[PDB]
Design an enzyme around this catalytic site. Structure first.
Site, PDB file in Angstrom:
ATOM      1  CG  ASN A   1      52.291  25.580  37.017  1.00  0.00           C
ATOM      2  OD1 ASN A   1      52.206  26.314  37.990  1.00  0.00           O
ATOM      3  ND2 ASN A   1      52.537  24.300  37.118  1.00  0.00           N
TER       4      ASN A   1
ATOM      5  CG  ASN B   1      56.911  27.917  35.106  1.00  0.00           C
ATOM      6  OD1 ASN B   1      55.757  27.472  35.173  1.00  0.00           O
ATOM      7  ND2 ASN B   1      57.946  27.096  34.910  1.00  0.00           N
ATOM      8  CE  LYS B   2      54.612  25.447  32.421  1.00  0.00           C
ATOM      9  NZ  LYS B   2      55.037  24.180  31.823  1.00  0.00           N
ATOM     10  CB  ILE B   3      53.977  33.229  27.980  1.00  0.00           C
ATOM     11  CG1 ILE B   3      54.100  34.707  27.615  1.00  0.00           C
ATOM     12  CG2 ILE B   3      52.811  32.617  27.261  1.00  0.00           C
ATOM     13  CD1 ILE B   3      54.349  34.924  26.146  1.00  0.00           C
TER      14      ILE B   3
END
Lengths: 369, 369
Positions: A179, A181-183
């Protein structure tokens, strides 16, 4: 210039890889980018098999479904996590069993896991919360003793390690999110990791509508449309090439916070278990507000004025209307972390000076030196 | 040069719109491309509300879920359709009720719908099969008489019309797919259409994890991760601009086939209901093989030699293991169309001369003049 909480980091490599997909016409189900990304990701984790799916939520769903989770089964989960850890239990018709978290690590407390096991328990979903690995040798020991599956919710923890093993490779099946916002991101996407090749093969079949590939439109069982697209996979390959760079930055930001909060009694960063390395997805702190007498939302408004974005800790799931029927115990540590917790900026767009500025400004706003 | 069965049609506009998303950093949940695509799509359909989702399967799931479909409910469906029409009934815990299709239109036979209604029937999912609208005035009359919801599976039928109304705007809720082979693609994606603004608002909330937007991570009910991404929506806006061009081509290919098969007793194209206009997603024929004595797979191998790709008709769902418990009746027309049916090439990459070549070569292979 600007501090970013969790914005993705996209530039020329992502544009190149996405244009290769559009130019090849491979943007959808069929194409070489999905299996290329599956194999490169499995190599990064040092695991036999990966299956690319449309979200982290879908990854957890498909993992529980593959393991035969169904009505009457009890699945143990922490009270603090994103709700998509738990929803898939209910998609399968199973019963969530909520347990409290460790006051220092913020992860599922294995002593509370063991107290909550019954004849109906089938699995545990530990969550590597904010990228911080759970107490996996103890969790795996409990699971072995009671005959339980372990599904790792590794969605926030790509790059985190437990005693030299990548998260998502310890439990029976691991689950990742891509998604925004993930790294790393594919816009939307996720991944199943497992050393069981049969589970991985059957999951890839199920997330492709359970279609028999040797026939035309013949489906021998009920499946899902949970596959990652080739458009998403082409973006994920670009991001995966940059993952080492991004994890260096995440670990740097975390170390910058670990330093400026150093010896400050009122600020406790989330703690790692011995031998574990967090991915530091969102460096998160508990504030002793007894002397400060500000709420977290008051602290967040002061930070926002200084251009420092933050987010509150996940709400305790046991106070959501569909789950309050399963609120069994005080969840003291869960409530302490929600009431006094805050997540700090850690987008890989940030400079080290931005992070230092954020940490130093918080000490001012809290009236510490 | 090459004939294409159903390949997507991507070029410079798609590249431009996708690069705008990467450059804006809006590739994931948040961003302006999703609501822009929702509003442009709702304007194209002349419907009040659209919600962008991750697949056509998800669209049908979310529609049934929103309408309160649950265990004990009976949902009437055709025996010939893609399995993703039906799977979502089972996701909701409901019971599918299979009925036969009209021998000429290949769509759900309303006389068979009415014979199959019981005290437990809650809804009908007509399928506009290969883009051919169902007998909607009769379906809607039956639904009104018995108090039933109508969910249109319009996934193959974007651009098709029923008596001057776009498909997906007639039933209570419509469902579209943007999978790679559909008339437009986002790689993966779908859309819910409805004139009920409350249903549309609650569905957008549910497919965004049922998160209360006024709080942080507070979820008042169980939701899903079913939202379209902004990366997908940026591609869908490019394709939607080209949709009029593509539908002109689809209708041209269909008319080219309608002509060369003209007066040929052994070849019957799928027929439209009076006042309906198919989108002609895959012009599909029934072959009278009594004089020909070749099977469809034999005919397909001869076509493949001539570089003409084809596909068989959807298998009858009542012979899939999970659904055979619901096989109630002979499904004579379903079996006739599966046994004697074939789908012909109709990718918008094709030239008119390619289609004419395909139709003429089939007449040769079948030994007709």
């Amino acid at each position: 210039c600007e501090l970013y909480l969790d914005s993705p980091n996209l530039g020329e490599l992502e544009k190149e890889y996405i244009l290769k997909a559009i130019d090849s016409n491979f943007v959808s189900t069929v194409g070489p980018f999905v299996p290329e990304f599956e194999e490169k990701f499995a190599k990064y984790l040092r695991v036999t098999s990966c299956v690319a799916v449309q979200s982290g939520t879908a990854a957890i769903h498909a993992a529980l479904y593959e393991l035969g989770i169904k009505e009457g089964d009890e699945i143990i989960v922490p009270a603090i996590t994103f709700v998509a850890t738990v929803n898939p239990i209910v998609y399968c018709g199973a019963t969530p069993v909520f347990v409290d978290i460790d006051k220092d690590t913020w992860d599922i407390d294995p002593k509370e896991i063991e107290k909550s096991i019954t004849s109906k328990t089938k699995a545990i979903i530990p969550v590597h919360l904010y990228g911080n690995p759970c107490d996996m040798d103890e969790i795996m020991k409990i699971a072995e003793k009671y005959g339980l599956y372990v599904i790792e919710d590794a969605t926030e923890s790509l790059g985190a390690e437990y005693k030299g093993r990548m998260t998502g490779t310890i439990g029976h099946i691991g689950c990742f999110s891509f998604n925004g916002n993930k790294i790393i991101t594919t816009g939307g996407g996720g991944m199943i990791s497992t050393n069981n090749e049969k589970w991985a093969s059957h999951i890839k079949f199920l997330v492709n509508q359970a279609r028999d590939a040797s026939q035309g439109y013949f489906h021998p069982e009920i499946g899902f449309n949970y596959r990652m697209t080739n458009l998403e996979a082409a973006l994920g390959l670009a991001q995966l090439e940059r993952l080492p760079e991004f994890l260096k930055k995440k670990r740097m930001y975390f170390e910058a916070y670990k330093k400026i909060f150093g010896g400050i009694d009122e600020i406790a960063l989330q703690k790692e278990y011995e031998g574990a390395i967090s991915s530091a997805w969102l460096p998160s702190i508990k504030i002793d507000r007894k002397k400060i007498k500000m709420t977290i939302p008051e602290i967040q408004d002061k930070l926002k004025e200084k251009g420092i974005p933050t987010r509150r800790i996940f709400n305790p799931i046991v106070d959501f209307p569909p789950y309050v029927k399963y609120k069994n115990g005080n969840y003291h540590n869960s409530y302490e972390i929600f009431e006094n917790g805050l997540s700090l900026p850690a987008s890989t767009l940030n400079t080290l000076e931005n992070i230092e500025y954020a940490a130093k400004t918080l000490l001012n706003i809290l009236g510490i030196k």
